[PDB]
């Protein structure tokens, strides 16, 4: 429970390439907003294709066979990720404040949850660096066979705005541990935190060009990376629609390797025998956590028929109770949406729900006068055909669904292009074990929600993604396997 | 070595869909050519889009929750794969003959190598079915976390003509072991053997819809699969060219998962201290194996200056020695190319080589005047910038190169958009060890070539592929990871 720095010095507002700060070729900039006040915080360098080209050559050089970064011990790569984490913890109050400033999330979140997960991912993967093993293989014939786990190479990385430092860690930590080099494009919203961190990557002792950071727009800077002919791998976190473009740009350019971490319409499923007050609290937090701007948010609450009215009333009361206000004041649970578009976009979805036949139970309008705050909104009587039931709202709007049968709710939960996450609330063993098989999602929770750490693999089924991030499974994306098969004189077991 | 069946009965020439032989919806057929004579062996059904929809419907139903395929034991999936190995070994002669008839490969190859690799690959992945383990994870908090290794779902599988039975087995064996269903598109040049196999899949007792076979054209039948909106994964083996289209098609459809096994221009590299006779014999077979129609063929023989003349002379002699002729004769080493289009494409490359100032050393024209035979061809004094140095010939054309230093040959070997395979020939330990780190290839041989068994992962660096086939690493493509995270009352080590 420390004290936030209410308005700090922001020395870093340029591109980070080859371990030095410099402007865009064109010298352009663009504004970043504070969503609570609505006012422009400051200007940041606007990257484009020429700037990317620079970063890729820097990255490519740091990955040259013989390079400091390539020659170095895998354990030294770990120690660097560990130093980096020491530094993040030293500047924790600055970083958690700068995150709240630029993104709008509560400072209790930023500090306690976000920055903690940033420290642990760098520390977790640090440990993985010298533990990632290839195989020796007792193959047929007079042969000694083994696999090498080499890095994939220059890894392009594109992240969204909703967890700016977390999402950065999810990308950098594993790529660096497996020995790769990185050209990262951060969101156009929320660019400031990631630049301060880049300073600590330099201070930690990472060689020039191993990490390069680029502020700028998606259609320009981002698509330059996804289309570059000398980028070995792209890793994209963002919307399902842009995901489709990224995989096309890979196939259109150089057949670079692709991981996609995309959207969700993740169901929260509450059975009869569930702990009532525990389900209402978790399903509430499932949705409204990070103001609904969370990829796997519980944006479709399905509740068993016999407990629906009780569940409804409590869920609304929890939303009415939810403290909306300035995120720097500790005890604020809900900050503002991240920018003007998202604010208007969510408000449009609220209107749309009403127009289709859903009952607005509470909130459903702007909170206050300044900034991009919205009153916690809950809908009832919601049907599967409705647009709010099908589309990723990405804001503080909780639609409630009724169901009768177990076989019914699994069909309805899965009936979507999404498949990032899901959950069951139940006291029953057998029913818990059925839902873990039946639900088409990459992460299934039982009697909890939004539990994701550096150990837990995370990614989507179907149009929610390709591949997985975090855990041991998250290293595979940043690994290119070489098979080495050597003729030998005689072979013995 | 047994007698071949010269005039086998060919009962199977239709689509295989839901364990039923059926004509295409259009009733259209198309002919397959014996490349040894040039005559039409017979007609097979010309599948198109409407026929792929029907196949994918069947594969989807077979994959439903509660279907026989899904709730079967993993060890029964193994026994099915083993039973099929037995049936293949029962009909080994028939199948190796039908392969020769349709592909043109020597009957010695078809029986002793191809059909042995097919039996071994089905028996190998039979073993993996019930040994493919997920994780239990010591995760932060009051949680029990584990991973399930689920099948990825409906897998679209597209294969080339050069090793029909083997390419099918590399696809079906791991896919089935991990519990997927399959829609397979086999090459138009060689549709017959793959259909007789489907007859044994039925006889082995696989459920209906689990394996489906479509004969038909690439831009029609193959594109129908790759673009299909209910196919979960596409595994494509073919040209780099078509590879770009498959990865684009995925991004353009439903974000299906993509493994690509693509072309090569793999270098064999001979050092001064190598066993000459052996290095000559191996580099010779590296290229001329399967009439040069091999993805990872040693199609750039690099040789150290001090042994070059002696190497050249011996290589040329070997080329002139290689018995060309009818593949059904036991001592034939080189059959015809697969069809007229491939036959002419290679003679184009032979002409093109000499136009660029490459020295022709032997062969260089048709062999005889019936079927699609070409003379073992070898090219002296070849330079990096020539089209025959850069492009995949896919025929019995062995260009020789010359080098002085190691750092030189590593540069020159790696300077290509390909990276499927490579080899080095040397007696020295440090050198062998250096080349295994330096060469940018998914497979690196030492004092041998074309050693690929079920045990050994196989796939490309750069534009030669995305992901890996065979070995344990071969199972990852056919696996969708689900993370389960359960709230527990308390957590102890
Ligand atoms: N699964 C996960 O790990 C995860 C985590 C957080 C958010 N998300 C998802 O991300 C979305 C929210 O972020 P968003 O709206 O800013 O997504 P977005 O697709 O609009 O942009 C994300 C990033 O990609 C860039 N980009 C945009 N268009 C591009 C293009 N044509 N080519 C290359 N790059 C481009 C942006 O500049 C930004 O850096 C939601 O749909 C959410 O569910 C997923
Ligand atoms: N790396 C490996 O595992 C491996 C093994 C053997 C062969 N190969 C490669 O395969 C190639 C030779 O086979 P090929 O000549 O039939 O190549 P190809 O690209 O023309 O076609 C391969 C398969 O895809 C189909 N196809 C063609 N165009 C298509 C399209 N637009 N959409 C969907 N499917 C399409 C064909 O019908 C065929 O079944 C060579 O490049 C060789 O190196 C690779
Ligand atoms: Na902002
Ligand atoms: Na044929």
Curated annotation (Swiss-Prot), chains A, B:
Belongs to the aldehyde dehydrogenase family. It is found in: Mitochondrion matrix. The active site is at 261 (proton acceptor), 295 (nucleophile). The record marks 162 as: Transition state stabilizer. Keywords: Acetylation, Mitochondrion, NAD, Oxidoreductase, Transit peptide. It comes from the Eukaryota. Liver, testis and to a lesser extent in brain. The modification N6-succinyllysine is found at residues 28, 57, 340, 359, 375, 390, 402. GO terms for cellular component: cytosol; mitochondrial matrix; mitochondrion; nucleoplasm. NAD(+) binds at residues 238-243. GO terms for molecular function: aldehyde dehydrogenase (NAD+) activity; NAD binding. It catalyses: an aldehyde + NAD(+) + H2O = a carboxylate + NADH + 2 H(+). GO terms for biological process: carbohydrate metabolic process; ethanol catabolic process. CDD domains: ALDH_F1AB_F2_RALDH1. This is Aldehyde dehydrogenase X, mitochondrial. Its EC number is 1.2.1.3. Pathway: Alcohol metabolism; ethanol degradation; acetate from ethanol: step 2/2. The modification N6-acetyllysine is found at residues 27-28, 340, 359, 375, 390, 402, 405. It comes from Homo sapiens (Human). Homotetramer. ALDHs play a major role in the detoxification of alcohol-derived acetaldehyde. They are involved in the metabolism of corticosteroids, biogenic amines, neurotransmitters, and lipid peroxidation. It is an enzyme of class 1 (oxidoreductase). Gene3D superfamilies: Aldehyde Dehydrogenase, Chain A, domain 1 (3.40.605.10), Aldehyde Dehydrogenase, Chain A, domain 2 (3.40.309.10).
